[PDB]
Ligand binder design. Structure first.
Ligand SMILES: CC/C(=C(\c1ccc(O)cc1)c1ccc(OCCN(C)C)cc1)c1ccccc1
Length: 207
């Protein structure tokens, strides 16, 4: 499926977190490290969104609305995929892998354990890189914003990406004719973790 190939080649290069080595470890350092990593990931996510077919043909407002509603889900799906080959550890970056102790010290134990629940499920499903890049595009298109202008166009985008997933799964996993549906059913947990994380992100006043 062409869309998948396209998403695969438009996939952004790895970003380093570069935690400040002179700063003592604390919950503030973790939050600062993560706060700066996401900022840079966000800039790249925008450049990546423009590669999704049909996306840059939406109005500017509609483009913002989607990103503004899906940014956290996308950042979270990334750390999750980077962590599939690990155990009880989240790889925010190659130079910033958080274990349970660091999560506790960061006051993110509950949140990270929820991100680990997502990872646990995808490991079980043997989530391929192709499904990762597509699910990420879908999460953006299906972000459920309230301020979309052209609802038809956004639903259109949703459909072309959904079709790519369905098509990919139809040819790569003939052994499971319901894989695509299983993949779509992992989205609720993603939405759930994302909204809870966004909540925390505001309680902390990050901005
Ligand atoms: C779960 C870690 C995280 C962020 C994160 C998620 C995925 C990823 O790849 C990198 C970081 C996080 C932290 C800050 C943030 O704000 C950006 C806006 N400001 C900093 C300009 C977004 C996500 C976070 C979110 C809310 C509170 C505390 C931590």
């Amino acid at each position: 499926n062409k869309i998948v190939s396209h998403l695969l080649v438009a996939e952004p290069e790895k970003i380093y977190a570069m935690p400040d080595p002179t700063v003592p470890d604390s919950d503030i350092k973790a939050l600062t490290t993560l706060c700066d990593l996401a900022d840079r990931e966000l800039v790249v996510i925008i450049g990546w969104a423009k590669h999704i077919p049909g996306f840059s043909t939406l109005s500017l407002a509609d483009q913002m609305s989607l990103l503004q509603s899906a940014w956290m889900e996308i950042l979270i799906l990334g750390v999750v995929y980077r962590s599939l080959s690990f155990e009880d550890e989240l790889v925010y970056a190659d130079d910033y892998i958080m274990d349970e102790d660091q999560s506790k010290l960061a006051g993110l134990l509950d949140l990270n354990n929820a991100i680990l629940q997502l990872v646990k499920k995808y490991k079980s499903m043997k989530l391929e890189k192709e499904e990762f890049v597509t699910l990420k595009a879908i999460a953006l298109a299906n972000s459920d914003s309230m301020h979309i202008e052209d609802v038809e166009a956004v639903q259109k985008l949703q459909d072309v990406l959904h079709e790519a997933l369905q098509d990919y799964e139809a040819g790569q996993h003939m052994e499971d004719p319901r894989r695509a549906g299983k993949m779509l059913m992992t989205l609720p947990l993603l939405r759930q973790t994302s909204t809870k994380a966004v909540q925390h992100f505001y309680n902390i006043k990050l901005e």
